Every structure is written in C-alpha cells, then in structure tokens.
Amino acid sequence: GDSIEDKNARVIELIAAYRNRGHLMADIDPLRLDLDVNSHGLTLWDLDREFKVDVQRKKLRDILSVLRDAYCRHVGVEYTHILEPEQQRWIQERVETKHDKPTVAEQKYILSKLNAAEAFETFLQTKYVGQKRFSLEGAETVIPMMDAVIDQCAEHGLDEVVIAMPHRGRLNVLANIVGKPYSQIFSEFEGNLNPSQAHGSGDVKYHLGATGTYIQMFGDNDIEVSLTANPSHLEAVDPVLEGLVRAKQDLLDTGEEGSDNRFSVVPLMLHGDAAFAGQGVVAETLNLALLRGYRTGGTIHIVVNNQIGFTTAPTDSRSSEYCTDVAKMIGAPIFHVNGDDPEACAWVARLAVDFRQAFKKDVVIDMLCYRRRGHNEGDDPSMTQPYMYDVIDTKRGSRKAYTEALIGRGDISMKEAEDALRDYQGQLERVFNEVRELEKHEIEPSESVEADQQIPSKLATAVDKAMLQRIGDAHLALPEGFTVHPRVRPVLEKRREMAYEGRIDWAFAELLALGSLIAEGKLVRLSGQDTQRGTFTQRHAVIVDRKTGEEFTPLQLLATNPDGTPTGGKFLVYNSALSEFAAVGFEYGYSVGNPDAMVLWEAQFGDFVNGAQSIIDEFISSGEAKWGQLSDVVLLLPHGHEGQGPDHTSGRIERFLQLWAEGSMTIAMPSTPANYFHLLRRHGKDGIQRPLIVFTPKSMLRNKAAVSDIRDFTESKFRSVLEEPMYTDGEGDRNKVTRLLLTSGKIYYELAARKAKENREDVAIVRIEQLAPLPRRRLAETLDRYPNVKEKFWVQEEPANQGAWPSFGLTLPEILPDHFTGLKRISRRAMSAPSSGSSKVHAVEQQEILDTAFG
Amino acid sequence: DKNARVIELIAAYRNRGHLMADIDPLRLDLTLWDLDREFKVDGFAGVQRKKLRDILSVLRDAYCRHVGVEYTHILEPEQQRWIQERVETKHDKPTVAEQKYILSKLNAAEAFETFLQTKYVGQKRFSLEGAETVIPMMDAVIDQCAEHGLDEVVIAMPHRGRLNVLANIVGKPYSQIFSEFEGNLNPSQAHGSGDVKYHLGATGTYIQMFGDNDIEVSLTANPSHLEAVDPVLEGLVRAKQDLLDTGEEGSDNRFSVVPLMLHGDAAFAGQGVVAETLNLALLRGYRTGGTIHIVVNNQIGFTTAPTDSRSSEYCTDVAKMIGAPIFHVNGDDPEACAWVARLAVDFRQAFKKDVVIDMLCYRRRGHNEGDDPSMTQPYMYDVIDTKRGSRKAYTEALIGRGDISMKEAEDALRDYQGQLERVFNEVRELEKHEIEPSESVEADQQIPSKLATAVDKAMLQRIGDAHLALPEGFTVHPRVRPVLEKRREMAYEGRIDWAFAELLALGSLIAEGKLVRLSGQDTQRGTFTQRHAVIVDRKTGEEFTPLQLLATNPDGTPTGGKFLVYNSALSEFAAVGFEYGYSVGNPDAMVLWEAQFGDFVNGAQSIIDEFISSGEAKWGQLSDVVLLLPHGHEGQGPDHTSGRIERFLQLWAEGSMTIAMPSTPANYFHLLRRHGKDGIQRPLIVFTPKSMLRNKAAVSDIRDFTESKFRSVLEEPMYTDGEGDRNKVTRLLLTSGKIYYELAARKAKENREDVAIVRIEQLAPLPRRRLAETLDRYPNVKEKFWVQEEPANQGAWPSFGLTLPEILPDHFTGLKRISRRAMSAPSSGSSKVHAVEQQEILDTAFG
C-alpha cells in the first residue's frame, strides 16, 4: 500500500498526544529547575509532506508548529478531562491559532502595571526593612493578569468582581488593583492610625479588604471591584467568597434563582500553591460549584504558584502532578502559564473570563513563578533552598526583562523607561513624606465593639391572628392534582388546626416566624443537611408529590399578597451538601453579601458544627471586632441529652459561651415554640447585623407540654427569662419559694413535672432563654419577686465542664453578687465526651439530676 | 481509512465507555460492512490482526457491562497497559466451590440484617440491605491480600453495614453484638463513658478458605463525624509498617499492612478531609503504599439526592487527583464485585498506590430503620420495592446452573438463622443487672512512683558533639554553622536554650532505643529558624540529621531508636489525625505534631474533640500523641498569638490529657522525657514559645538536666537557691508561661521584696498537692492574683477562676484576675496596641 496512509495515522496520534499531554513538556517554569514507540514510518524527511487532518490538508512542519505553539511553549493547557465536546472544541479553536500581537499601547500599559508592582515592593523594602509585607516580587505578572481578568469582565458588561486572596502580594493588589490609597497603606506601616482605622481590636494589614471602581482604558465600560477581608487560615475565605457572590447575584436577580442567567457578579479567587493542595476546604468549596443552592456561574481561580510553601518543597506538599489537580473533578479547564511572560499571562486571563462567560463554570489559571525574597522579608530561604536561591539570584525580574523586550521592539527608549520608573517612585516618596508629617495619635488599649449596634427603641415581633391563619391555610393550598404522601398529609392538617386553635408546636412556630417575615417582604434563605424535610421528619418545608415527585413549598405562597401583588419576599430552602466547613462559611458570606436577608444554617446535630470551627472562630465570632465586617447568620444546632450517644447530644454551648465577648453574638436556648418564634422575628427585624446561635430541640419537638397558645404569638414578645406559668398567670404563690432552680432548655419540663408530682410549692424554676448577652436586668428583677429564697442552684443536664455552668458559675456571682453569691451546680459529672454511649446509662444519670434538684 | 475509525473507536471505549456501562442496579437514569474486516491492534503479547466484530465484543464486555473502568487519567502508560491486559481479556471463571462460598457470604449478610429486624424492630442498626455484596467484596480483598502474603489489613469505615462487617468479616462475636442490643453489658463492656454499637472496632485472624495463608484483620473505632477516621487509619497503618520495617522507612518495599477504607457516597464527595488525606498518599512522611477504597454508593445520603450532594459526575472523582484507577461496579453482580476486589489488590501490590471501588447499590430501608424514605424519595422506593435482592438472584442462578439444589440452599440459610437464634436465646437468658452512672477513666492509668528523667553529662555532650559530626565534605550554610557550634558549647557549658533542650530530650530518648517521629509545617528547620533538626548542604542540597547519630551506640551497635522528622503538607485536620493514628499504631513511639502557630490547630478541631480528648473514655483507645502549639502575646495579631488554652482546659476531664505551658528549657526537657518514659498512654498538649526561644533569661544550667526532674509548680530561684526571704511576701502572683520573665524583671527593677511569683507549669491535671505545699511557704500573703496576658474569657482564668477556689478553698478564696479585657479575638491587630495593653497588666500586678 501507500506508506502515506501509515504516516497519516502517526500524525493523527501526534495531534492527540500534544492535546492530551503537551502540557507535561510545556516551558511553564521560569526557573527551569527540572524504542517501542511505533512511528508508522514517519520521520524528519516527511516535514514538507501534506497530510489529512480532521477536512483539511496541511504540511507536517506546519501541524507541528501549531501544536508546539499551542501546547508546549509558555502555556500548558489541560482540558481533555472535560466531558462536553463543545467545551473542548471551544478551547481548541482559541488555542490552536496564531494570536493577535498586542498593540504598542497595550504593551506600554502592561509595562506600567509591572513597574507599579515591583516599585511598590522595592519602596517598602527601602522604608520598612523590618516589617513583614509578603512581597509579590518574583510574581509581579499577577498584577497585569488580574487587571486583564477585571478588564475582560467589564468588557462582558458584568456588574462586579469580588476577590478573595491570601497574603502573597495582598498589599500590592490592594494598592494597584483595588485602589486602596497608598497613604492608608503607609499609615498602617507607620502605626499612626486615625480613630476610624483604630476602631475595634483590628487585624494585620495583609488581611484587609477594600472596594473601588475599575475604569477600562481600552473601552467605554467600568466595573465594581471588591476584595473581602480574611483571617490567616489559608483557603478558609473560599466558601465565604462564594456565599458573598451568591447573595449579590440573588439581589440582582442574576444567577441560579434569577430571571436571567447572567451570573453577573464574578468570584475571583486567588490561592498559594502549598495551601491549594493541602487544605480540605478547597475540595469542599469546589464541590459546591454546580449545586442549585450554591452555584455562582463559575469562579475564576488564580494560583500564585511560586513552587514553595515557606521552607517546604512541592514534593512534601502534594501528591498530585500539579497543585491544581483537585479542580479537574468539577470539569474546570486548567491553564498553566509561565509567570515571566506578561503577554501570555494577560492572554490566558482574558481566555479564562471568556470561557467562564460562555459556559458559566470554573476555570483555573496556574501562574508558575518564584518568590524573590524569603517567605517573609525577615526570613533567610537559602538555609533550606540553597539551589533554588542560587538560580533566583541569576534571574532578571519580569519587569526588567519586559522593559528590555519593549526597548528591543522599538516601542520605548532606555531614558523613557528610566524616567517612567523615577516618576512612579517620586509619587510614592511624596505620599510617604505627607503621611510622615501627620500628627501622631496616642496609642490606647483596644475597645469593645458592643455599643456599636443597638436594638431599635420600638420593635414588636407579635403578629395578628390573620397572619397565623394565612400560614396554616398555606399548608393545604395544594396545587391542582397534587398527591400528598399519606404520612405527610396529617402534618399539613395539624398545621391548619394549630393556626386556628393553638397548641402550636416547635416546628410550626419556626415556619410561622419565617412565613410572617416573607409576608413582610423579607428574603429567607434556610439550608442544611436534610433541612427541607427536617432531620426529625418535623419541618416539611418542601413536600414531594407521591406520584410524580413534583415539589410544593407552602411558605412560598406567602411571597404573594392576597390581592396577587408580590411582597418582595422569597423562601429559598435547600438540602446542603454533606459539608460543615464550606456550608457554614457559605452562609456566613451570604449574610455579609445581603444584610437584609434572613439566613439560617442548620446542623444535622449540633455535635457536627465543630467541623466548621475555623469559620466560627475566625469569621462568625470575631469578624466585627477584627475587620468591621458584619454578619447576621443564624446557626441552628440540635442539642439535648436523650440517650443517643456522645455525637448526638451536644452543640457545645460551653464553647460558644467562651468565644462570646463584646456582644458579638446572641446565644439562645429557647424552651417554648412561641419564644423561638419571637427570637427569630427579633433577629430578622432588629437591623442589628450580629450572628445568632440557637440550641434547638429534638425530642422536645414532640413533647405535648412544649406547645404554645395563640396569645403567645399575638400578644407577647421575646422573653430572655421565663418564670413558671403558675406565677405569671396561675394561682402560684412566689412567697412560698425557698429553693430556686435556674436552668435552660428541655430539662425545665422534667423539673416542672417532678414539682407537680410532689406538690413542691417551696421550689421555683426560672429559665434563662437568652444565654448571651446575659439578661442581667430581667434576671435581677425576676429573682426579686421571690423574697424567701434561701438557696439557688444552676441545674443542667450537661457534664460539669460543659453546658452553661463553666461560664455562669463564674459570671453570675461576679455580675449579680447580691443574688448569686453561694450559687451551686447540679449537673452530670465532668466528662471527656459530651455523654455516655448507653441510653440506659443516660436515663440513670438523668434521674440523679432530678432527684438531687428536689433532694 | 476504516482502521482510522477503529483506533479512535478503541480509545472512545477506553476513555468514555464507563459513561454507558450498566453499573446502576436500579436503572433510574465506520460502517456495518467492516465487522468481518481485520484490523491491526496492539495486543497484550504483541501486534495482532483482529476482526472489528471481535474488537467490539471485547470492548463492550470490558467497559460497558457491569464494570465501568476509569483509568485513562493515569500518567504512567505501564499502569494503563496493566489495567488493559486484565480487563480486555477473558476473566477467570469462579469454581463451583468458590460460587457457593460467595453465596454463603451473601446469606450471612442478608440473614443477619433480617434477624435484627425481627428481634429489634425499634433500634437503629444502619443495615446494609441493598448492598449485601459489600461482604463477599471485602472477603475477596482480604483473601487476595493473604494470597500476596501480606501481614495485616486494617479497616476504617462509617455506619453502613458496620455491624454486618464486624460480625461477618472481622469476627466480633454475635453474642457481644446481641448484648449491645439487649443493653446487658459486662463490666469491661460498660467501662468508661462508651459509644454507640456502630462506632466500635475489633481484631481477628482471617484464614483463607481455599489457600494456605492467614492474615491479621482489624477494624478501628471512630466517631459519628464521617470521614474523620480516614487520616487516623493512614497513621495507624504507617506506624505498623514502620514497626515491621516494611514500607517507606523500611529495608523492603512490601508496605505489608494494607489500609482498607470504606466510605458513603454523600460523605466521600462532601467532606474536605477526604481530599486532605488523599493528598498525603505519596508523601515521604505519610505514604502507606496505597489504600484500597470502597464506596458503598447507595445513590442517597439520608433524604438528599446525589444532585444536591456533589458537583462531579461520580462521588469518586476527587481520587483521580492522585492517579488512582476507579472501578465502578454493579452491586447486584456478586462475581463482578469479587473480581474487581481482587483486581484492586493486585493493582495496589503492583504499583503501591491507591485504588477506588465505587460499588453502585441501593438502600433497601430508610436511612435508619425507623425512618420513612418514601416521603422524600417516592419514585426510588417504588422501584426498590420491585427489586429481588442480590442474595435471592444469586441463589436462583446457582440453582439454575445445577450447582446446588433448592433444599441445600434453604438448609444452609436455616442453619445460619438457627445459630443466630441459639446465640440470641443464650444472651436473653442472662440475668439483667442494675445500671449505674458512667465512671471517670482517670484512675485507669497512673504514673510510676519517682520516675527519673535526668540524664548524665556524657549524654548531653554526645548530643552537642553530634551537631558537628558532619559527613565528609559537607558544606554547612554559613548562618546555620553558628547554631551547631553554640549547641556544642551549651552541651558542655550550660545556658541551654529552649530549642536545644527539645533536641536533648528527643536525642536522649533515641539513644535509649526509642522511635521518635516529629512533624509539622516547616518543622525540620523550625518556623522560628530555631530547630535545624535537618541541615542542608549549601553546595549539593544533601541533608544531614544530627540526632540520627544517636541511634548508634559509641561501640557501633544500634540502640533500636530512630529519628523520623518531616515537613508536613499544609494541612491540620489530616496531619493531626495521622499523628494521633500513628501513636495508637505504635504505643512505644514518641510522636509529636507541631502547629506552625497554635492559632491554626482549630483546623483539626474534629480530631481534638472526637479522638484526642475523648477516645480513651469512649472506646478504650489510647494515644500518647504530643501537640506542640506555639503560643504567646507578642503583637503579631489575632492569628499569631493563641493556641486557645481555654478550649483545651474546657475539654479536659478524667485526666484524659496532660496540658502544660513550661517556662524553662530544662522543665520542657523533663516534661518530654516523662511523657516518653512513664508507660502511660495519654495525649500531651504543650503551649510552646516564640520570642521566649531567644530570651537570654529563659536558659537552663547543666545541673537542671542531670540532677532534677519535671516540676509542675516553680518558685523564683531567689527563694529556692538564693538569699530571698519568703516571709517578706504579702502579694502572690500566680502565672504560667513567658509573662513570668516580665513580672520578674519588674520585681527586680523596683526591688519588690513584698511580691512573689509562682508558676503553674502543668495546667492539667492541676498539681493540687505541690501548689498547696508551695503556697504554705509564704505565711504573710494577704492577697493573691492570677496574672495572664490572655483576654479574661481566654487563657487559664475561665477554668482556674472557678476551680482553684473550689479545690483549694483555704488558699484561693478571694483569688482575683489580672488580664486583658474579655475579647472576641485572641488579641489586637496592632503591635503598638499590644504593647500598651501588656504594660497595663505589669503596672496592675505591681500597683
């Protein structure tokens, strides 16, 4: 036969090999630190021969030049893992082509960005040699790359770019991308902060955020750009950024629940190479990318891959070939780019935005670069990486290299390049001198943020009977032909009955609170594991057609007024992924993104919220004091000793009470459905942006004593302290009381049952519903109504080192000494775990507490 | 031409055939003239010429029937070829005896579940019904490991089929499982606070049914927190491999202890610890030679559908990042499940890397046996109601093939059921005894009386001299050489600093024959450039570890000891879990994990809460892991200041952990030596210094190492050795850590003979007797203050403010706090604000 047919088969194999694996041979590293193949008779003598390619006939040397330029030069493209052939074709069409050369104006603009990037760092090195700044030197190309992402987003007519990033080049991005004034950055290095800057306890300069407007230089558009605050904990901000962006998209009616699919707010997420591979929150957050409750239409990721993590080499940081391999699980294309090629970096940035816009999905840019100085500017890296730093010492920086290229191209002269550098440096010097001339402020200890936010003087949470009845009737306003599951129908009928006749249970009180807020025009977002039905089969926020699987959400009917006009409200209820860290981070971010939303996250059991401990510690409990960032997220934590074991008993009340300070959070453990209703309505209507932690029930959901009357919803308010109904409404005599039992939560019902069984008129039980801030005035005023009390006990089912005792045992005798001197504890013994593993052992221990309280 | 269509068609089946494979038991979701034409293909024994008809039948059987194979993401062509050779050829047909054995495992699997359903209808058991093939699959993994002559299989798994695996794979007695359902436990079963039945572990010996080998099989305990045990399993296996001299640090590369890790579908996709643990798989400090993963993929997670649980096509897509092949297999085909299990073991043995089996199955009952799944999944449960189980279908096949008769099949099933009934009746006949409250485990482990931790001068000198015993031609970095010279000087002359005291402790243990494993972020050099446990040749990059020289006696014989020091990945959850597991796996090892700053250990909160602080009380599982947490107010911000002492003190109970904040290098040395030599297996939490590493006052004398012991309470040297008068003291300041040096400097500056400073070095268990004895030496004290740099809601005050007046009322009634105000964060963000607040504490203490 004709050997051209054999040779053509080898050409088809070569095309596939470059597309699939060319990235493994690409010249992406700026440091350059690192017989049985069947050729089917193809050799170097076939270079000028024409071959058939899939339609077209091309010379072998031309096929090989296109493949080598696309896949083996300064850009490594990974895309053949993508399922969708139209996405692979889209990328092939754009990378297997001769690129348009940037104009001289575009080249000068890129150089102006590299000048700003390096000169900002060398200026800080000269003025503040002894202060950490986490310089981007060796990775200056991140600045024209980020400029190109934002400029391309503006070109697509998008609304906003929200950035989250770590420390590397943070100050550089704040000054040269977001527009944080140089004077403000210099004031931080000077330690001369005005009262606004010195507010709260604060945080380090490389954790701060900023906002501004980016104005295009090559087009007629502009776009908002924001950079969010973050703690030191690397990658922890990743789900927070997604939540912030989702909330902004929902507000613009763009995105998943929106009237259009523009997803017009773009998350731009930066990462370090060691952190991106090592932190589990990265995979958890990528896992949210296509979920209906969390999708943001694609995140643009940039890894500042300086091939080091402090003193650790990549071989000790990851098991994958690339630090970006984790992102392939959601079908993201990956572009590995040589950080010493500014034009390739800008081109990849624009291609990434175009791909995100075309397919509304994630894209990753792996920018290979290096770290010019030590990990921080006081660290000596040659002790552990002598070879790498001997190579770095021989390298001209990307600014100098690009300047020489433009001089060589004839664009600029050496004198012009020198003058432009002196001008930028001269402007930094001028601003530095002005800041240094400012009057020095006296340094004072930091102050509590407690008084910065206060409840309005007038706020009622009660609703009328018509509102209760409307929410009850919504449960039976089924779509025509809908088949209700036979074991769900009694719940719907019971809700109509409770709305008109009382005995309202916990689950319905929660829906009365959320439904009445929706009717008043509020956006309510509720999510968590199995939250649509409820872990305890109690919520039924979504009901499923038994014959068709169609879904009906009764509370969504409250988003329309009886006359047919919208209230402006909405109910967004989702089953979350099986994640705690990313889910809690996302809801925290969502509440920051839309302060007017009611945002609730529900743990399956409170025992699993320790999986989100970094979010609780670094964002929820402390973001207001550290950054002035406000969140109104609600965490619902099912809690209570019921004999189900040490991981189905406790939400670790003691840990939240320990974290509490400065009125940063509200912490509550309501004992009645109406009090929970009023708590949620107060939180949604008070205009205070502070988190709420609620310890919620499990067996108490179906306790026939734990029900509320209609008048408790229509004629009452949130009560931080509750007395027994016999004293406030009944014929109970407070003067007969000699023993006071103080408690919180479901144990009240067991104590009250024991009091009734033994007719103990000498014992009274007082509940603390709001654990933090402690209701000092209401507690003192309640205790003053029992003048003959000789002894007081704090009673709890939790072990002695858990529950409220560790904080209350110390604080109650200090803040109210005339009431709580001599306060004693009644509880389970101190325990390493939250409870026994045995239901029978739980029952004996529970009875001991009750016997001790009445002994 | 037509051959061009064939080569691309072969690639299409290999790359994407899995997308069309018949893997779901529920089924809820160029020309025809070329068939007899011969084409050239790359056969497994050389180039072959095959009819297109035969190429297509092989590809459809390999990739589109009950097994979906994902492997073309793997970099190594030899691994793809290995898989092709085994999937694109005829599979070995099981013998009739092997088929009957698989059926006996399905019988045991289903009959155990239906028996518990009959006897204990109201108790959760997380049944494997709908996924019974996991039992012959696990049997096949373990049998294939025994066929390779491996030493042990260690299993970690969640709740799904846990009781079934304990009884039918590991050999936990049926009588013990029934006693758990009965709630009639003997005193050993009732020991500690305990845990739920589907969290418990067991160990036994597996004996091959057809071969001549045995193998050890163990299943580790775990909390409810799904996937949290994954890094613990890897640590336990690595410790066992290091002991057998197999694996990464071993003389052979057998990696002869196999991790077998089971997962649920929703948890495997959702929990970040999965990716963190996979990321450890090829790292020198953590590699275990490949984990075999089995996902029990029942296409549901409680009430949540897969479309709400993950963004990837498969729940296993995360594992592709470490190049693991993935085998998706139809759970209703027991022979395909066993065949994939054996293939996975063979692949793990050939390439010493991870393999994933995604077993597609269903969940016969609700999430738990009291839950109604048709409320949320009506369609799925209408389909499940029409399905014959895998046991019934496999029995019908064997009866149909003529392997067994219906009478033989029923007799075998009734024999197993009769034996369950007999054991159940025997357990039910036992008298029920009084149920008592659970008891503290504190007294279970006690320190031997007068444990000596001092070493002689020769030992100190040997460790100092080891720092300059450089290999021939080694070039020391010019800024590292002064540290080595200073260590030799300190070993002979004193003024021993914190960093060298740590290495004196570890070095002296290695010399005594102990394995010491030390790891953490940048731990080889040290975050504060203080450790230099490994030094790097300035010219060649070669590494030298001075403490490794202590593993050889001066006469040249080995001590039996070793120093394993690693830079960890940038992980806290998987790294802490791994070190906890390692300490469980080798109780004789000294295992230390170091946080870069203590502020980041909250990333491992699930491991601290669920394993470290509570595993002894819950499961009787003992760990001696050490956590080193750099801590101290130095003006570096709220994430570079605190290891959250207050949280560890709150978690503390029952003597479960030792918690310490030493103020001197010798006291830290004695703390580490006591921990390594006391024969007690309980974790140690140490709050370690940063600036105090280089404080010239924070140095120790040679006599502090050779003639002393760990001191839980320390007085000022002026009273124990100097000319200080204790009777002049009217104000006592109690403290812990570096603030002691600032308080002592202020006392010396103002000649405050009326003030004494007492340090509590061991925070938990509180040294009640030594504290009382010390305070009794100051008879004229009129006021006592607890002084700390931490905010009032942090540090030791929240626990000590409550416990000291209760446990020592004649000494601490009236105890007052001196500290920073209560704060939402651990500190101010400003170094200047920190400095003003620090001076306020010092001024208040002496005001």
Ligand SMILES: CC1=C(CCOP(=O)(O)OP(=O)(O)O)S[C@H]([C@](O)(CCC(=O)O)P(=O)(O)O)N1Cc1cnc(C)nc1N
């Ligand atoms: C381990 C670690 C760093 C190395 C990161 O390497 P890579 O991701 O490649 O980024 P790059 O630095 O190469 O660009 S910087 C950071 C630290 O905390 C600085 C960051 C910060 O505090 O904000 P440090 O004070 O310990 O140095 N640090 C401690 C650390 C540990 N664990 C977590 C979860 N977060 C952290 N901040």
Ligand SMILES: CC1=C(CCOP(=O)(O)OP(=O)(O)O)S[C@H]([C@](O)(CCC(=O)O)P(=O)(O)O)N1Cc1cnc(C)nc1N
């Ligand atoms: C969300 C959740 C479960 C669903 C798992 O689905 P999948 O991974 O597909 O497994 P399978 O059940 O389909 O086989 S079972 C488990 C729970 O905790 C039971 C497990 C246990 O407690 O040990 P529960 O009491 O809330 O039901 N539970 C709560 C839970 C939440 N978050 C974590 C980290 N761990 C958990 N145990």
Ligand SMILES: [Mg+2]
């Ligand atoms: Mg890096």
Ligand SMILES: [Mg+2]
């Ligand atoms: Mg509010």
Ligand SMILES: [Mg+2]
């Ligand atoms: Mg499942």
Ligand SMILES: [Mg+2]
């Ligand atoms: Mg020990």
